[PDB]
Every structure is written in C-alpha cells, then in structure tokens.
C-alpha cells in the first residue's frame, strides 16, 4: 500500500546527509526516487499496484540535471495506465 | 568515420514515411537517433571513437515527447568525455 511506501521513503530520505551531490531522494506521491548524481537518470518500474493491471513492470524515469530533478517521464497516465472502467471510460 | 555515420543515418532517414507519428529518426552530428513513439525514450552508446578513450559503452538518452525530441542527456562532454590532454586542459 502507498501510505507505507510513503512512510518508508520519507523516513529513509531523513537518513540522508544535508549536503548531497546531485539530486536527493524524493517521494513524488507514487514512487521513491533514489538519490542520484548530476547527469544520471533513474528508471523505476511502476508501483506494485500495477501487477493487478499489467504483466509488465512499467518504466518511469527522472533525469538528475544540474538544475534539479526533471519531472517523471512519461507522465503517470502513460507510464502506469489504469483500466478505463476506473476512469469511467 | 563520423561523416560515414552521418551519411548512412541521413540516407536511412530519407527513406522514412512523410507523416510524423512520434519523433523522427535524426542525426545530431554524433549519433543516429532512431524513430521513437511519444512517451518513449531511447538510450544509445557513445559513438565508436569513444572505444579509444574508455572500455565503457557510455550511454546517452533522448526523450520522445509529444512536443518533440528532448536534448541529448547528459550533454555529450559529460556523457562521452574526451581526454583532457586533447583540450589542453
Ligand atoms: Mg502497495
Ligand atoms: Mg496488491
Ligand atoms: Mg567511426
């Protein structure tokens, strides 16, 4: 469940140093992004609820640039699509 | 030769359909980027020459976004760095 993942992420995140190089670890509502260095990107699978909707693990990515993290790509509607009957489509 | 990679990429690129679905194959001066769908990204190794500087492939990403291709990431001098002697640095 997402509340527990959230609590794991946000607590781990507290154990990180105040000064990191690159991009610090971050919870974005759905996924815990691990710390990364400038010029690295991190690819994660969809959260675990996605196995009820797909055999594929999915792929979501964030680039760690020198101005900070990029937005997750592709957007979550695209990266981790839910059944249309849950959208009322 | 990089002029031979360029040529072969371009001759491949001129054989593609006229209509743009996704982001078209493109030659950025170092790499031949294949066609990609919206919301996909492509990762390529560094060009062949990099094999003189490192026993790594290196890795360079572009994102195919609904507004087009993003820039190569990380930027080439980070992604595929050249010996500092070459730049008398
Ligand atoms: Mg869960
Ligand atoms: Mg479950
Ligand atoms: Mg060559």
From Swiss-Prot, chains A, B:
Top-level taxon of origin: Eukaryota
Extracellular topology ranges: 2-89
Disulfide bonds: 9-32, 23-64, 46-80
Residues listed as glycosylation sites in the UniProt record: 18
One Gene Ontology cellular component: nuclear inner membrane
Biological process, per Gene Ontology: adenylate cyclase-activating G protein-coupled receptor signaling pathway; cAMP/PKA signal transduction; cell maturation; cell surface receptor signaling pathway; cellular response to glucose stimulus; cellular response to insulin stimulus; determination of adult lifespan; establishment of localization in cell
Keyword hit for Manganese: no
Gene Ontology molecular function: G protein-coupled peptide receptor activity; G protein-coupled receptor activity; growth factor binding; growth hormone-releasing hormone receptor activity; peptide hormone binding
Known tissue expression: Pituitary gland.
Main subcellular location: membrane
Cellular compartments annotated: Cell membrane
The keyword Cytoplasm is annotated on this UniProt entry: no
Keywords of this entry: Cell membrane, Disease variant, Disulfide bond, Dwarfism, G-protein coupled receptor, Glycoprotein, Membrane, Receptor, Signal, Transducer, Transmembrane, Transmembrane helix
Annotated family: Belongs to the G-protein coupled receptor 2 family.
General function of this protein: Receptor for GRF, coupled to G proteins which activate adenylyl cyclase. Stimulates somatotroph cell growth, growth hormone gene transcription and growth hormone secretion.
Associated disorder: Growth hormone deficiency, isolated, 4: An autosomal recessive deficiency of growth hormone leading to early and severe growth failure and short stature. Patients have low but detectable levels of growth hormone, significantly retarded bone age, and a positive response and immunologic tolerance to growth hormone therapy.
UniProt name for this protein: Growth hormone-releasing hormone receptor
Organism: Homo sapiens (Human)
